[PDB]
Design an enzyme around this catalytic site. Structure first.
Site, PDB file in Angstrom:
ATOM      1  N   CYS A 263       0.427  -1.245   0.042  1.00 30.35           N
ATOM      2  CA  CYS A 263      -0.399  -0.168  -0.134  1.00 30.35           C
ATOM      3  C   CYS A 263       1.021   1.098  -0.310  1.00 30.35           C
ATOM      4  CB  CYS A 263      -1.268   0.176   1.147  1.00 30.35           C
ATOM      5  SG  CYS A 263      -0.304  -0.285   2.749  1.00 30.35           S
ATOM      6  N   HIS A 312      -3.060   1.552   6.879  1.00 23.55           N
ATOM      7  CA  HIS A 312      -2.736   0.961   6.338  1.00 23.55           C
ATOM      8  C   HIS A 312      -2.783   2.611   5.697  1.00 23.55           C
ATOM      9  CE1 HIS A 312      -4.563  -0.022   2.048  1.00 23.55           C
ATOM     10  NE2 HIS A 312      -5.423  -0.059   1.999  1.00 23.55           N
ATOM     11  N   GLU A 324      -6.359   1.873  -3.992  1.00 19.27           N
ATOM     12  CA  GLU A 324      -5.524   1.292  -3.217  1.00 19.27           C
ATOM     13  C   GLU A 324      -5.004  -0.107  -3.554  1.00 19.27           C
ATOM     14  OE1 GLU A 324      -8.038  -0.730   0.509  1.00 19.27           O
ATOM     15  OE2 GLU A 324      -9.201   0.579  -0.086  1.00 19.27           O
TER      16      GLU A 324
END
Length: 350
Positions: A263, A312, A324
């Site tokens: 990520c 995240h 994402e």
């Protein structure tokens, strides 16, 4: 059943965020390691400079020593001797200063080389621990998603009832990402940035160990607007479909795992297109740019999850959707913005 379905999706997202937290934890201390490595290499390049001037002062003193090596003629030869003597005195105190410079440069390099060694073994063991916890988390997650698909099937029933050739492999992947990145200004800016910082996927110190040679040494990464946003976002969209890889990614595209993106690696790639050098850790990226309240987020903002962005990160795409790289087994994808588990702030870099 509707409740248990929605609760196993809540649990799914818990376990997914925990997995995220561990992965990013390792990413963080990987960053710390590569920066300690750069610290160590800078300290000994200093130590080498010290030995260099000590040797020049050395051979200067030896040249003056080798220089050291009727009444009127005696007078003028005494003055010649005084000239030689004062040159040796100069070079003497010069050598003492250089000797102290070497003493302190060597002790500082000793210390901070050891410091980088420590954090290296530290993060390899942290990797071990987080690999075990991650494998547990993803086994639990897969049984949970089994449960979830089953429960949906049962609910449908209820509603009804009611009514080394890896070289060739790598060359192929290179062609892939290279033409998926088809703008040229943005990629060359990202590439400059990529060449400015160390590989955030390995641990092995890419610097010399012996006080010999002198490489380049990488920068230190830890603690109009519309055109800028479209270049970054177009870059992220350009990687849609690329597989996920823990620790994967740089300014030019996907990389080998520990060929893909994780990520915080993906966001680094997109923003590097406008010369924005980002660290490979959500928690450190959370420290960059300007923070904005989540209710005022707009295209280009970074969405973070977990306490202090520990779990995240995603890029807001605008119109209530975001891009994402969410979890293992999922490709880089566009999803509507998720509000559960979100951090207290979003980050706007442009």
């Amino acid at each position: 059943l509707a409740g248990s379905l929605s609760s196993t999706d809540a649990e799914i997202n818990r376990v997914e965020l925990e997995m995220g937290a561990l992965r990013e934890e390792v990413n963080k201390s990987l960053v710390d390691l590569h920066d300690a490595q750069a610290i160590a290499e800078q300290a000994r390049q200093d130590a080498l400079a010290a030995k260099k001037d000590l040797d020049d002062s050395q051979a200067q003193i030896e040249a003056a020593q080798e220089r050291l090596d009727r009444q009127t003629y005696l007078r003028t030869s005494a003055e010649k001797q005084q000239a030689a003597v004062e040159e040796l005195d100069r070079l003497r105190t010069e050598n003492a200063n250089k000797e102290s410079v070497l003493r302190q440069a060597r002790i500082v390099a000793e210390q901070r080389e050891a410091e980088a060694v420590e954090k290296q073994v530290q993060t390899e063991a942290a990797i071990a621990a987080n690999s075990e916890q991650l494998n547990v988390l993803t086994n639990n997650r897969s049984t949970l998603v089994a449960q979830r698909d089953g429960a949906e099937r049962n609910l449908a029933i209820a509603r009804a009832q009611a009514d080394x050739x890896x070289x060739x492999x790598x060359x192929x992947x290179x062609x892939x990402x290279x033409x998926x990145x088809x703008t040229a200004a943005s990629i060359a800016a990202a590439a400059l940035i990529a060449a400015s910082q160390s590989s955030h996927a390995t641990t092995q110190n890419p610097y010399p160990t012996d006080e010999d040679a002198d490489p380049t040494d990488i920068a230190d990464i830890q603690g109009d607007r519309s055109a800028q946003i479209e270049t970054v976002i177009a870059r992220a969209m350009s990687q849609l479909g690329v597989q996920y890889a823990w620790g994967g990614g740089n300014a030019n595209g996907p990389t080998l795992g520990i060929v893909g993106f994780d990520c915080s690696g993906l966001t680094l790639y997109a923003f590097a297109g406008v010369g924005i050098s980002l660290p490979h850790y959500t928690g450190y990226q959370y420290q960059h740019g300007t923070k904005v309240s989540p209710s005022e987020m707009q295209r280009g903002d970074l969405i973070f999850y977990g306490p202090g962005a520990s779990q995240h990160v995603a890029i807001y795409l605008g119109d209530g959707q975001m891009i994402e790289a969410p979890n293992s087994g999922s490709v880089v994808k566009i999803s509507p913005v998720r509000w559960s588990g979100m951090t207290e702030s979003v980050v706007r870099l442009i």
